[PDB]
């Protein structure tokens, strides 16, 4: 345990289901977002733990934990799909965990208006039909 005035109330995981390509659920693991690690408990033995920001692009759909990490190890390279009810917690948290370490979370949808970027077209010219 450790005798140095160290509390235990600091565990935030999420029972996420490990789904395959199709998405018919495989088993069920505990997604953990420690102070510096995405430890995805599974089979009470295998721990798919990344370095948090070691990912590449992470998303979620209502109650679906989606996270993709570049080539490294554990399971391999590719996108990951998970089914949980605390999808919000995990995401929301992560989004915060990133701001704490200035981590990269290039967010695309941010409700725009009219058009921020510009494409090659102007100036225009009359064709004269």
């Amino acid at each position: 345990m450790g005798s140095d005035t160290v509390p235990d109330n600091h565990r935030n995981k999420f029972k996420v289901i490990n789904v395959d390509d199709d998405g018919n659920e495989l088993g069920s693991g505990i997604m953990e977002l420690t102070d510096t690690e995405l430890i995805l408990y599974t089979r009470k033995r295998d721990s798919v733990k990344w370095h948090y920001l070691c990912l590449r692009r992470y998303g979620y759909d209502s109650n679906l934990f989606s996270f993709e990490s570049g080539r490294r190890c554990q399971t391999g390279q590719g996108i990951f799909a998970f089914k949980c009810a605390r999808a919000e917690e995990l995401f929301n948290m992560l989004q915060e965990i990133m701001q704490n370490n200035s981590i990269n979370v290039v967010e695309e949808p941010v409700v725009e208006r009219n058009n921020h970027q510009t494409e090659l077209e102007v100036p225009r010219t009359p064709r004269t039909p």
Binding site: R56, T75, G78, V105
Partner: peptide, 22 residues
């Protein structure tokens, strides 16, 4: 594979958001 849980998708999914964390 090392067993693990997090399966592989190798294909995007109908997500509601879009935050690509490098």
């Amino acid at each position: 594979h090392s067993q693990m849980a997090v399966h592989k998708l190798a294909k995007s999914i109908p997500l509601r958001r879009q935050v690509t964390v490098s």
